[PDB]
Design a protein around this ligand. Sequence first.
Ligand SMILES: *[C@@H]1O[C@H](CO)[C@@H](O)[C@H](O)[C@H]1NC(C)=O
Ligand SMILES: *[C@@H]1O[C@H](CO)[C@@H](O)[C@H](O)[C@H]1NC(C)=O
Ligand SMILES: *[C@@H]1O[C@H](CO)[C@@H](O)[C@H](O)[C@H]1NC(C)=O
Ligand SMILES: *[C@@H]1O[C@H](CO)[C@@H](O)[C@H](O)[C@H]1NC(C)=O
Ligand SMILES: *[C@@H]1O[C@H](CO)[C@@H](O)[C@H](O)[C@H]1NC(C)=O
Ligand SMILES: *[C@@H]1O[C@H](CO)[C@@H](O)[C@H](O)[C@H]1NC(C)=O
Lengths: 358, 354, 363, 367
Amino acid sequence: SLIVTTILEEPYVLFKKSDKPLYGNDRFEGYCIDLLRELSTILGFTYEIRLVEDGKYGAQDDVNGQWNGMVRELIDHKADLAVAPLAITYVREKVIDFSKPFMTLGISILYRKPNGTNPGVFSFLNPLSPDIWMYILLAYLGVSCVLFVTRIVGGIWWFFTLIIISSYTANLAAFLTVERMESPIDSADDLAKQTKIEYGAVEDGATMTFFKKSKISTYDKMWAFMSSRRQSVLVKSNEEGIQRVLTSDYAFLMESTTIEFVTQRNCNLTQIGGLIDSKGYGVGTPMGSPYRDKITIAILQLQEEGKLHMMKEKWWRGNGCPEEESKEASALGVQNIGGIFIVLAAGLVLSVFVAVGE
Amino acid sequence: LIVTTILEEPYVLFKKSDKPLYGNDRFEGYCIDLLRELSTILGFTYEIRLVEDGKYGAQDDVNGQWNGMVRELIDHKADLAVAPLAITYVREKVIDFSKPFMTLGISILYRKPNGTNPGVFSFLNPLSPDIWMYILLAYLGVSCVLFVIALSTRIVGGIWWFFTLIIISSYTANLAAFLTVERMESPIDSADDLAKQTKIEYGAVEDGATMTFFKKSKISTYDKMWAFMSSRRQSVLVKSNEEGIQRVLTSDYAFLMESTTIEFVTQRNCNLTQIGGLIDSKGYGVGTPMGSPYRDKITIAILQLQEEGKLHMMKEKWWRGNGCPEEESKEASALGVQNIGGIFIVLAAGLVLS
Amino acid sequence: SNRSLIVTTILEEPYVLFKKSDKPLYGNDRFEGYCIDLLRELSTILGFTYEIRLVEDGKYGAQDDVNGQWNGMVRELIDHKADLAVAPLAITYVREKVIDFSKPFMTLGISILYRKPNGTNPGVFSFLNPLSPDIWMYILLAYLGVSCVLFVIARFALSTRIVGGIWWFFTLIIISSYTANLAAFLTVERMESPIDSADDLAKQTKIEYGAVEDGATMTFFKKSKISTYDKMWAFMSSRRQSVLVKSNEEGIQRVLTSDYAFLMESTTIEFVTQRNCNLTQIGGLIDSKGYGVGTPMGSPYRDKITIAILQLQEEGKLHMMKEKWWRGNGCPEEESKEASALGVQNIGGIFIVLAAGLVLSVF
Amino acid sequence: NRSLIVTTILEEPYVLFKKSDKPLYGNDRFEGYCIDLLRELSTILGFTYEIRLVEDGKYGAQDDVNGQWNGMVRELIDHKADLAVAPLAITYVREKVIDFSKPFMTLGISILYRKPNGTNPGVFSFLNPLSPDIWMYILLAYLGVSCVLFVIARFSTRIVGGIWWFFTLIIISSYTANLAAFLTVERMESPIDSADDLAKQTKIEYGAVEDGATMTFFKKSKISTYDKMWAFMSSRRQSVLVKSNEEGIQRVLTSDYAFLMESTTIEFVTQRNCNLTQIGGLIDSKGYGVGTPMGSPYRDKITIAILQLQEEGKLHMMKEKWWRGNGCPEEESKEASALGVQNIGGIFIVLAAGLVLSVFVAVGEFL
Ligand SMILES: *[C@@H]1O[C@H](CO)[C@@H](O)[C@H](O)[C@H]1NC(C)=O
Ligand SMILES: *[C@@H]1O[C@H](CO)[C@@H](O)[C@H](O)[C@H]1NC(C)=O
Ligand SMILES: *[C@@H]1O[C@H](CO)[C@@H](O)[C@H](O)[C@H]1NC(C)=O
Ligand SMILES: *[C@@H]1O[C@H](CO)[C@@H](O)[C@H](O)[C@H]1NC(C)=O
Ligand SMILES: *[C@@H]1O[C@H](CO)[C@@H](O)[C@H](O)[C@H]1NC(C)=O
Ligand SMILES: *[C@@H]1O[C@H](CO)[C@@H](O)[C@H](O)[C@H]1NC(C)=O
């Protein structure tokens, strides 16, 4: 008799194909309903899973007063228990006394993973153009042959070496300084004062609503940019935004749980900052029925022992991810400077060969 | 039926002819071609009337009023008006517009990057010429002292080593500072580069729908640009574009103005380049009173033209005919030092001295 | 003249505290501090026979709109149990309407406490940062190999010229790479600057900054009409319960243990900075609310105290009293504040390495 | 309520005649922070006000010849002026004669000093990027290397050479990098940072206004940091002291100077002139306030009005309104400057010293 409303969400409620179609609750398989099954094994009761016909989320309507979404399946209290991805908003808390949230999270920014631009083993050749290097070699041969056939030539050679050292060091220092000045990522959670890396969120979603009703010095300018180019940055759904991020320089703003889910599904995306908003996901009941307190105490007794961590991991691992740097220093790498080692070894071995040849 | 056009230079001029003309089939331009194509495809015959009063649309926002070019040639004087203008709140509240035909946006005029690479440009640059003479005479003095002498050799070698270490460190450090200074500044200033810098000046037509977009729509970089423009109301602001092109032609100026005519200017004058792409979005259309008597025919014609593709080719040909040559084709600047040959020429001089 | 003057005070560490003595002590002798010194100066200027009577409510005056009743020092002043409430007690309109104050014996305001910018200065091996340790081992083995091959060639002059040239080129590349990397490392440090204003801290979002959950150091922001302060109040309101700590000491702990920039009255800020390092007052002064001495409305003492306070301001002994009670204890903990803008004092401890190489080369 | 007549000084940042003086003759004659403060007071408290300048254009100063007063306190004590809304500094000598409302603004002594620009001494131009201890350590290491080489000659063929090469390349790289960072960033800093820093030095002469608030405060200061300042000022009573204020500003603009002013006019000048800047924060903590005759009932309400203005933020609004006249022009876009003679000059002197030392020891060797 305990009807539980559900909504199909990629990391929360899934309709597994399995081998053959099933009927009832066994066909449905997802993190939320699995947690409900466990707490039903703990707290003794039955539950019947019911989906929402409309499939939309619950929010205040501009010209109706009544709310569409699960609220349509909640206005007449036809859903005894409501588990779904539901941010605890002001109006939702006003009308539903939501239990303690399962998760605490907020909107977070998503970005394409900054690939390491490897310039090859011969990276030390960059500061001076190769033509200048050929000039250096021809000058070396010229000064050597002139010396073969002494104060003036020695002084001019020393001055030339002076100039070459100075120029090479100046170019390399300028290149490394401009590389280090700009951060490999954008201004973390501070895409203001940038106006070049286009950023956007879902169209008229929870993130869009939050940015609309925000007055912080960074987020108000972010919302101004949102509204200025709404037809471009805003996307219909999460997958379209992810595809746009993959195909072009685009920063998305999505729920943090979805950000970690996606960035763990594939390692081509990263979460720059995180928790730039305060909200939570937890179940509730439209009426002040006494069993929501039982739900809260079930949540507390489930959290007092370690069981939700493992299910959260096994649900949000997906495939593996290659190791990535966390505290790499500013020191030159082997891949960045190994060219001089290689050329020195080659020069040494050819010198030995031509010495033993005669 | 009755239509109204605009007097702006980029879309139409006053074509010279002996026949008495007042704006009926005796002009030229892309707007004239658009109007004639619409009339022919829709079969509409009428008279075309020029601008009576107002430039770009007179605005009287002191009491929410607007008279010139907007309420004297669009609403009541003429039933319709194909006047090329942007769509904004003050117009679209009552004067409706068709779906956009071209997307208008402001981009930046800039000086074309010219590469000056003197042979002796950085060989004697970081060190002052007086310092160059000083180090030459110091070398001469230490050489003559060594000649006079030939222990003191250890101390003279040590002081020479200390001096040469300092002079190399100073020279290399100053060259690195110069390179860093010239490299931190963007090789081409973009929609965000101008805001963060102050050496390069930017401006546009005073309240010519450009800084109207800047006063509202508070974007961080855009707010910084608007503050900088308001700081210098004349120093960084130019009165129009007909002389703004000449101003930006030889100066450090940047001129913010719409994409179509900046493309026209860059094509007709390759000496100036365009940067930034559609940083703001604005659409074209036609004037329309309350009721839209002839919206159906114009919408049908423009959607048929969009599905036809004739607009794309007419746009390309008309806006490229003045710019058939393209001087800028493979613009690219090397990051490393190029043609720094002063050290090579002095090495050659030293070699031939012997 | 022959009447005891009852005064009240609260336990604020910089201002008034119980005298540090294991032996029990009673009366005015048991209280000591800056405000106690001020009261002693007032007593020795005017004619006072004063006894300190600690406020039982343990709070400052607050207009309780539930019943329209005061509390703490202000309410204690309304009924003349004590007629001189000398204490850290801000001059506010809600108080000044109901109670009567003298001139501000010191002016303060809201200011931001921020942890000093940590730098990678410590470490005698900081000169080896630009080149990775594996690269250093590669350099050492290349030096050993080139020495060995040169010795072999000598044992066994075009080849000598070639090996000399290749070694010179290798040294050229390695020294230029090291110089360039260390120059970039020391240039990006001077390139970035810490925030030293309220505008800079309000524009940013990474560095959290919030006031205390009960004091008036946030109530100014709530009623503030200035753009930047209103924006930062909106920011800290959007992230309440996380950047609005309950008490000052846990705010200091959070600042020490996190990228948190606390925000409270300037006197406490400078007291903390002099007493404890690692923290500085980055902002100058946001608000301005001087303290004062309590006084019942129908009491001439205020006026006289007014004059007395001004007397001290003319004598300059208020300045030295504040220095003694604020900076005097911080003298042992005075920060180095080196005048050298380079900040390169023994960054690279290569002298020790050179000495070790020399003594090993002595053989 | 009759009409309260206020007496006001003509201090520049606080009270100015209206720019259109020819057609204005009413209460709109005067404009300034004090004037619109009084306007806000009339908006918040019901009373009409008539502005009158003090006759002699002076502040209230005690006249010791007969015990009388000098300026606008004279008509306060005689009830000739109901209010004195003006920059009346709250002082003990005045408070015994008149009643001051609680300060609407707090000020004090501060150092006006020229904004640093491109300049650098000779030897310290290149000695700066390394600490003098590091230079002495380098010299000691060079001497040690020389004596170790002498011992080796008298008794490592290449090990000492290699370690010395490593040491010298590390030192040259560090020096080059540090001076490159200095040239790229160019983080200018004033020689003085606080009062004690200016007290210790003697190259930059001080400044004040003779028979002014600053000089009187410095006299009889008895503070260990300001008694030396008073002694230095007494050393040259004609040079460092300035008979006026604009004269002192011009002097500090046109020459090396460390003038001393009230913080309000300090910030007014620094926001009006980019060449100048403020040092020391606050030395004294003098407060302003409106003046009233003793026993005037309006003090207890005008202090309430001032506290309201300060709490609601309108005081800060009118403060920021008429002290940022144009803002600070910051460009930071000029750094392509070569090493001139001034930028690096000490190297010629040190090499000449080395040369003369070498020739002296050479001619002494023949002995
Ligand atoms: C790799 O990084 C570069 C540098 O920003 C940029 O082109 C882009 O983010 C990546 N390029 C790819 C994935 O082709
Ligand atoms: C080269 O470009 C610069 C930058 O505007 C300027 O000196 C000038 O426009 C050009 N110099 C010429 C044409 O000699
Ligand atoms: C040192 O720097 C680190 C940088 O991550 C930061 O924890 C803080 O600024 C400093 N911490 C301590 C304990 O000094
Ligand atoms: C400052 O931070 C350091 C680093 O954690 C710590 O050791 C020290 O106790 C702190 N306080 C000081 C130096 O007063
Ligand atoms: C730079 O400062 C010196 C300080 O003596 C001053 O004489 C000179 O006029 C200043 N130059 C400027 C501000 O251009
Ligand atoms: C003073 O005026 C401006 C403000 O900084 C400055 O550019 C100028 O060089 C200065 N001139 C003198 C003589 O100090």
